[PDB]
Design a binder for these strands. Sequence first.
RNA 1: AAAGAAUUGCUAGUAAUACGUAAAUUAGUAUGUUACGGUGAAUAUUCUAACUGUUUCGCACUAAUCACUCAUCACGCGUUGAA
RNA 2: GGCUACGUAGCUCAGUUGGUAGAGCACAUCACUCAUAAUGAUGGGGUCACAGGUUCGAAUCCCGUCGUAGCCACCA
RNA 3: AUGACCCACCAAU
RNA 4: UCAUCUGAUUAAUUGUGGUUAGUAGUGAAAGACAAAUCUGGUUUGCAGAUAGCUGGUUUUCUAUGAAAUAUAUGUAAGUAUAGCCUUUAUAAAUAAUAAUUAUUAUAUAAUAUAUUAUAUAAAGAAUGGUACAGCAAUUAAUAUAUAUUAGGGAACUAGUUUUUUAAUAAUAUUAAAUCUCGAAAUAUUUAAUUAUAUAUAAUAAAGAGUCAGAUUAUGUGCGAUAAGGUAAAUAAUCUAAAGGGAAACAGCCCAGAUUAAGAUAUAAAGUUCCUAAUAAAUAAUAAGUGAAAUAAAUAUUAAAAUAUUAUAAUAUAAUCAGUUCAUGGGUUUGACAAUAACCUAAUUUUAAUGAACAUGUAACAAUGCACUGAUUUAUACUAAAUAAAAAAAUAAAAUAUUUAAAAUCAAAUAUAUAUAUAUUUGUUAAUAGAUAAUAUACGGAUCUUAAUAAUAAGAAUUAUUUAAUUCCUUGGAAUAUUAUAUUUUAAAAUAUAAAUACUGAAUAUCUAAAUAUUAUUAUUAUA
RNA 5: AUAAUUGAGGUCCCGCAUGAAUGACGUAAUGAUACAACAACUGUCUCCCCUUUAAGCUAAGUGAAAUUGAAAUCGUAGUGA
RNA 6: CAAUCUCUAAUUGGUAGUUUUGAUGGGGCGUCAUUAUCAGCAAAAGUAUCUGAAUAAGUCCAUAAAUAAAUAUAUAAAAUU
RNA 7: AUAUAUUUUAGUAAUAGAUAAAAAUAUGUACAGUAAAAUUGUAAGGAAAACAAUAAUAACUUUCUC
RNA 8: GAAAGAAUUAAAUUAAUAUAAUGGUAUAACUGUGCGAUAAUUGUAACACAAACGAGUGAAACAAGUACGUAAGUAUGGCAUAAUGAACAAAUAACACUGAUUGUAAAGGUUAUUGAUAACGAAUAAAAGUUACGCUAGGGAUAACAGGGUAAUAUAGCGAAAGAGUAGAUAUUGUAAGCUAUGUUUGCCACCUCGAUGUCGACUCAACAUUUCCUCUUGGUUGUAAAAGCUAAGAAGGGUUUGACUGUUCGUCAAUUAAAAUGUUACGUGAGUUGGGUUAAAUACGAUGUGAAUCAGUAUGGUUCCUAUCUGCUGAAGGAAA
Lengths: 113, 195
Amino acid sequence: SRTSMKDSAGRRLGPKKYEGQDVSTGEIIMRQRGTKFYPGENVGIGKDHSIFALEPGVVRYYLDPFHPKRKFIGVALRRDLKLPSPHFEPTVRRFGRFELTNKRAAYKEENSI
Amino acid sequence: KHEYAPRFKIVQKKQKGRVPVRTGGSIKGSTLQFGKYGLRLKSEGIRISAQQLKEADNAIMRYVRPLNNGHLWRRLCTNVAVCIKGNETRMGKGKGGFDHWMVRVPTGKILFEINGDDLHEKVAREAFRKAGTKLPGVYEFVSLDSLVRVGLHSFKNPKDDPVKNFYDENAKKPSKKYLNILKSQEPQYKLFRGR
RNA sequence: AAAGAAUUGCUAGUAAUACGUAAAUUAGUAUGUUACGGUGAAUAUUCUAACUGUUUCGCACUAAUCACUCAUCACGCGUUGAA
RNA sequence: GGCUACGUAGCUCAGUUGGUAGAGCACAUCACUCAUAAUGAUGGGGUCACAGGUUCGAAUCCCGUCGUAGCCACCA
RNA sequence: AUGACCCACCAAU
RNA sequence: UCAUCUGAUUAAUUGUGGUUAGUAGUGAAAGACAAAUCUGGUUUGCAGAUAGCUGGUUUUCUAUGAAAUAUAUGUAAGUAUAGCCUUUAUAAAUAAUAAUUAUUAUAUAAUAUAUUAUAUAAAGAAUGGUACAGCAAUUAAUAUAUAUUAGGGAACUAGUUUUUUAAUAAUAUUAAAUCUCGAAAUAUUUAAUUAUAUAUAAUAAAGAGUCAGAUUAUGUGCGAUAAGGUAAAUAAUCUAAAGGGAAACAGCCCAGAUUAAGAUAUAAAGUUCCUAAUAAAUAAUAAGUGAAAUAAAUAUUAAAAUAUUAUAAUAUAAUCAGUUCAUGGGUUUGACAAUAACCUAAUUUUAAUGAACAUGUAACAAUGCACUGAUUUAUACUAAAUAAAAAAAUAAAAUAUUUAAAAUCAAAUAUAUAUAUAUUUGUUAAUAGAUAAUAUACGGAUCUUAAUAAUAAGAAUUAUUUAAUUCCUUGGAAUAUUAUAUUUUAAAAUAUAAAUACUGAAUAUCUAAAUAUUAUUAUUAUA
RNA sequence: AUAAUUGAGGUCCCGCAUGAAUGACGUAAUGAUACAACAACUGUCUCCCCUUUAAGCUAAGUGAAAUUGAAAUCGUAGUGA
RNA sequence: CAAUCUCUAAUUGGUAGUUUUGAUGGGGCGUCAUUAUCAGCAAAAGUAUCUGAAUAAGUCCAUAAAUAAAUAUAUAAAAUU
RNA sequence: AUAUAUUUUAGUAAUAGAUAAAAAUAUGUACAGUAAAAUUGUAAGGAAAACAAUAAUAACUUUCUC
RNA sequence: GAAAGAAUUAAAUUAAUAUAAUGGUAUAACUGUGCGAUAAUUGUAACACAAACGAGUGAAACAAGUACGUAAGUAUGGCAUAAUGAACAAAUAACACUGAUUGUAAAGGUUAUUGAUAACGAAUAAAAGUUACGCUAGGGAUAACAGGGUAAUAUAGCGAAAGAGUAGAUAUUGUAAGCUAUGUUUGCCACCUCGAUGUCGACUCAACAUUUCCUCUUGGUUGUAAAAGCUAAGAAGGGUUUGACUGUUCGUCAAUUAAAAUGUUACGUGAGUUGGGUUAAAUACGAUGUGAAUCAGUAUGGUUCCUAUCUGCUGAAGGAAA
C-alpha cells in the first residue's frame, strides 16, 4: 500500500535576533516566509522577505502609526532611542568612517580617483 | 437528515484525537434550546458512534411518533470519521479503512430534545431512560428548570453569568495595535502618510 | 429535373398522339365505360426462357413434378438386444 | 479488496499508434416466384456502457465508482 | 372433401 | 543379533594381481563411492587466509565520567562527522547561570493639562497561535406552520390556491490534526543591576566511548483511547547508583557510600503483633465493605435536600351520574382492535307542536373514559373518589425531583473599616452485581467490644483533623488531665514535673580518620 | 461393499490444473512396492494369566561413563529477564 | 587445397570468476530510496513512524511590434531666409 | 467638353486609450488603477454567452450663484 | 444652493499571483501602461542563517559597465518557499602558467562549459538466480512451538426490552445497541530460552475446575393434569461408551447408556510408548519458472538416544530423645 511517508525537514524560520539585542550590519533579524514583519527603520529586507541588519544598533519590534495593521522590526542605532521614532524630526544618522590620519593612507585615497 | 452521515466533499482519514474535557466551563450544547425535555450526558466525556446514536433516536421515536405535534431534535452530529484497521493485520503498514462516523461528547452536553402537544413528562423521562440504555455513557433527564451541568459533580445557571460589552472593555484597557490604529487616525499621521 | 431493382401494351391505319367527338348511367358531377374519326411509325425471326398443340426418349409420379421420396435431429409411446 | 483487461447500433465484430458518428446478419418495405426461401435494391439503431479534465479537436484521452476471468501461494 | 401444406439452381462436350 | 523375507547357472559369487581419483576417477544414476562416508579425499604448504561475528583479555589506589541522538553510509550487528566525555593550558576576560528591572494603571505628592517620587493593583520589555475558548470566514449539522422562488398539490372561477419539496435567504443552535476573529501558562529571549567565583562560559593542543536503550510521568501518531505495543516530544530514574520505602521490587517514592562512628535533627514511609516506633478528637460503616494492586451499566435499600401538597394515611366502605364513551363491530357495556377522553347528575315527588337557565348561600368538584386485568363481550368484578386517629408544629404524611456551595446560605480571609466589596471553604451511604482450573493468601496473625468488673479492652476500617484542651499571638494565657510530692480528714488541698509524640536512610549535623583543592596558619629544614 | 465406511472397487465427467515416445489406453506374467476385500488363524485385543531361561536383587573379585559454578538441594500463592 | 604459426572476427553455462541493494513491528511478496508544503508538532526553533496528504516537483518564462517622424516645393540666396 | 504627357491619390485593416481583471511575454524600470462573488435586470438568452447598476460623503479647495 | 475636484472612510488579499501547499500581498507582490530587453552583468564578498562535513540560504559593502527614472532612485532574474547531482574520466573552449638538455611541440595546469551516477553522498566501465545436498560465523537483536503481555477476537454473564410466544415483552423466547467478566481460542506484542522435540494424533496415566450432562434437593412453568418436558437455584459425592471411516483433534454414522457435560493441567501426559500425520536426504504427479529448483498441492518410503545425581512420588528398612 502507498505510504505518505514523505515530508520536508522544516525550515528554521523565526526570529533569529530578539528585542533590545545588539546586531551588526548584515545579520538576520528574522527569517520568515511572507512579509509578516516589514522592514523598518535602518533595516533591509532580502529576497525571501528575510529581514537583515543595515546599521549596528538595537533591534526593536515596533508597530507604526503611519503604516497601520503592520509590524516592523527595525534597529535603532542606540538603545536610548525608541524605534517607533517620532517623525517630524532629524533622523539619526551614522557617519561610519575613520579619517585616514596616516599620511600615506590619506595620500593614497586622495591621489586616487 | 445528514447528522449521522456528513457529506464532506473531500472525504479523508482523521487522527484519533481526544474527547475535550472542558476545563474552562464551556456550557456549549449543554442547554435546552429547541425542546421542553432533553437527555444529557452525566458521566465522563465519551465517544458515541453513529450506529449507537441512530439506535437511541429510534428508541426515542417509539414515544415521539404517537404524540400530536411530536418532535425530536438531534443536537449532535457524528462529524469525526473513524477508520479501523482490521483485528487481523500484523501492524501499521498504511493505516485504516474508513469504518464509521463518531462524535466527541463532553460531560455536560445534551444529546436529544423532545416536545409534543400532549406529552406528559413521565413518558418523556421513560423514553430518555430507554434511549440511554443503548448509549455508552451514563445519562440524565434535563428539564428547562433543571440547571446546567459543567463538571461531573458541579452545576451552573447561565442566567447568573455576567453580560459584558467587550468593545468598551478593550477601550478601557487597550492593546498596542488598537493604540497604533488610533494614532494613525489622528491628523499628524493621517496627513503625512503620503500614499 | 424523365423516375432503382423490376415490369406493362402494341406487328399497320395498329402503336403513338398536349388529336379531338358522341352516347349510356345523371335533378347534378367522369381523371371511368362503350363507340367515332383525324395525323400516323419504326422494328421482325433470328437464340435462350415461359405457356401451348405435334413428336422423341425416359419416367418409381397418377387430385399426376406445386408429384414423389430419403436420412438425422426433436416429441410421445411399445418390443427386443448389451451390460 | 484498494488491486490487470473487458460493459457498443437487436447479433457478432468494430475501430487501433487521435485527425470517426464502420461492417455484415438478423428487421421493416418493395420486388422475384404459383407461394415460400435464397438473390436482388431500399431504410431503420450507436448517447462508439457513467463521472468529471486536455491540445485546435479524443470512439480514442486523462482521471476512478455503479459492471467481467481474479488475486490467499515462507508450514515444520 | 380431411386435405394445412414444398422447396431448391447453378454455369460445357 | 535373532525371527523373517529374497536371489540362489547367472546382468551369479568369490580368491590372487593389475588399471583408472582429486577439476577429480567410478557410478544399471543414489550427489553413490574413491580407506568408518565426498554437491568433491587426504596430507603438507600458502598461513597467524579472512572474519563489521563469538568468546577471552590477568594487580592496586586515585580524580573525572558518557551515549544508545542527527547526518551519511550496498547502510541499519559496522564506520565516519558531529552531539554527549576527558586531560593540559589560556586570558583584553564574567561573556556562563539564575533572578530582578523594563510595562499598564490607580491613589497621593511635588513641580510644569501636564511630569518626578512614592505606594497599590495587574500573570507586568519583545516574539508566538497551543490549551482554553469560539462559530467570524472556511469546513460541516440542526430546527422552523417564516418567507420567496419556481413548483408538488388545491377548491374553485390559467389564476388563486394548500398540505408536502428542494435550494437559498432569515433567525436560532453546534464542531474541526491539517479553522482560530478572542486567548493561557509554560516557553524564546533582550539590555543593565544582582548572586553564584574554592564558580561558569569561551578558546588552544590533544585522547575517548557511544550511535540495540528501558521504564515512569505528561501531550500526542499508530493501534481497537489493546499491550511489559509501537512512533517521536518532555521530565526523571535506570542504564552507570550502593541506602530507606513500595511484602518481594533495574526504571516508582525518598535519597546520592571518601573511612569510620552512632549523640543530635530528620526524608520517603510507617508506629496492635510478626516488625524499629503513639496517643487523641470527630464523624460514618457492619459489609471483614475494608485493612499498599479501588471492577461496570444497572437493581435495591436507605440518607440528606428541594418543590408541592402536613400535620387530615395504611385503617374504611362504595366503586357510581353522560358512560353502555362514540365508530366499526358474529363478539365487544373496562380491556376486540382501532378511537376518544371529559360531562351531567345536588328528592322528596312526572307527557307528545317553546322559553338563559337562574347563587339556591351555592351548579363547579376528573372524585375514574371502571388503574388494570377479568368476560365471547358483558356480568361478576378490583376499581381514581380517601378518611377515622393531630400539645397542634418545632419535628416523623405522601408525589416527585434532586444528590448541588455554581446559585443561595453559613464560616472565613482580604481591603476601607462600625461591617462596606472581593477571594476562599462547606452537599450520600450500604448491599447486589462478584465470575476457573496445584492452595485459603489484607505479606501473615488478626482487627468492628460488652454495664456488671480487673491499673486495664473498646479498630488494627473509612472521612477530616490534633500532639493534652481551650483560648489567645510559631509563641503563649488559662485551665483540664497525667504524674508525683506534701501534709493533713481513700479522699483533701497545695505543690511540681510535664505537656516540646515516636520509629525512620550508607541524607544532614555532630564526633574522630584519609586524600584533593582554596585560604590562613604551626613546625622542621622554585625556603 | 459395512450394523455404521473420509478408505476400496465400479461408474458419472462443469478435466481447480489429463492426454499420446516427459508416450496414451488395456491385459497376462512377475513384485519383500502401495491400498482394499475374503477365508483361515491367532495373546493383536475383550483381559490378561501361568511358566522357562538371561538379567535385574545379595555375597566375593576386578571395575567404567556422560555430568559436575558452589550447595546445608521441601509444598503452595505471590514474585521476578 | 588443406595443415601448422600469427593476427582478426563469431560464438559459447561447454566452462571459469563473480554479484545478486536496504529499509521492513520477524522474513518474503507488496511498498519505497531526491526535492518542496500543511497537520502530527504540545503559541521560539527543532520534532518520529510501512503516519494523514484530493499532496506537489525533477520546471517554466528571453532576443521582442520593425522603420518614419526638423530645414523641407518652385526660384534666389545663406545674418537662421 | 475632351485628348496626351505628367504626376497625385485609392494597396481601403481595427488600439486613438498611459488603455486597466478577454487572449497575447512571466526578467528590469517608471507611472497609474482596483479585483471576485453575489442580486435587480436585458432580442434570441435558458443553470451556464455579453452588457449595465449595486458603501459612505464630514471636512477641504475651486467656480457660479441667491 | 450647485458643480467640479481632490479624495477620505469603510469593504476587500474570497479575485488574482508562471505551477502544489502554506506564508504574504491592495502601501499592492496583483493589474494596465511607456520605455526598454538592460542587472536572466563582471571581479573581491564582510557578516550572519542554517549546519557534522560536502553543501545550502540572506546579504552590507568595494570595484567595472548597462538599463529605466525629473528626481529619490531601483535593478546581480521571477512575492517567497521545490525545479537537482560529488569527485574521477573525456570533450570544447579560454588562459598565457608550466614546457624534463635547448628551441618549439606533446601533455598538464587555471578559468569557462558539457553529458549521470533517481538504491538520487554517486562502491565498477561492466554482475540475476536456486539449494528439501548444503556449509561456517552468529542471533535468538527481533516467528514455530510453549510461557508472558494484551482481550479485538473467542467464551460466558448482566442491565434494558423491541419482537416472538394462541390472548400476554420478562412460562419459554430476546435482534441492533449498552455494561462487564474470562484469559480456553484466532489474533496482536517480541518479553522469555530461542541446545522448550516432549515435535499437533494415539496409547498409559490421570490431576484439577465447575461455567452441572446424568444422578439429589427446589422455585416458575394461561405456556406444571399425569407423564414426559422447558427453565432457573443449590449442589463437584459418584458417574459420564464401544464400534465404521478418517493421522486425525473434529465430524458424520451405528449401537448403546442415567448421562455419554465443558474445560485447565508447556493445545495435561515419553529421560514412560507409538510415530500414522506435519516432518530432511530417494522419488513421481498436477501447477509455476528459460532453468536449477518450487509449491498451504497430492503420493510411496524413511533412525531416535539416555544405567537417575537432586527434587518429587511408591514402597522398605536402619538410626533416633524415651
